């Protein structure tokens, strides 16, 4: 089963995108501070995350 | 100013649904085509098999004729 494979493949580039644009990170994302998400998300992610849903 | 990522008023749907167009074609008569065309096709065999008979039947009286 290769290509269905590749294709929610593309789909989690762009989630590995957002978590670019929210944190920098590719995948390790520490982000989390124990006491709540410390370096909060900028302005510009809910739309597009309405658009990815 | 406060310039916080709020959505405005609330987002449209975002569909949760199972897309399945059950299409279909009801494939009893698909059975139907494909026996329909199956037996033109064996029509078309023996028409052409019979004549080519008659053609090779022409040929052995080619050889026949030419022998002596």
């Known amino acids: 089963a290769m290509t269905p494979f590749f294709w929610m493949f593309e789909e989690r580039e762009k989630m590995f995108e957002f978590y670019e644009r929210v944190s920098g990170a590719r995948m390790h994302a520490a982000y989390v501070r124990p006491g709540g998400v410390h370096q909060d998300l900028p302005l510009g992610l809910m739309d597009d995350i309405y658009e990815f849903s | ?68």
């Open chain 2, 1 to 68: 100013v406060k310039q916080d990522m709020p959505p405005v008023g609330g987002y449209g749907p975002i569909d949760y649904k199972r897309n399945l167009p059950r299409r279909g074609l009801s494939g009893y008569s698909m059975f139907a085509v494909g026996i329909g065309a199956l037996l033109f096709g064996y029509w078309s065999m023996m028409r052409w098999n019979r004549e080519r008979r008659r053609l090779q039947i022409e040929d052995f009286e080619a050889r026949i004729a030419l022998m002596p």
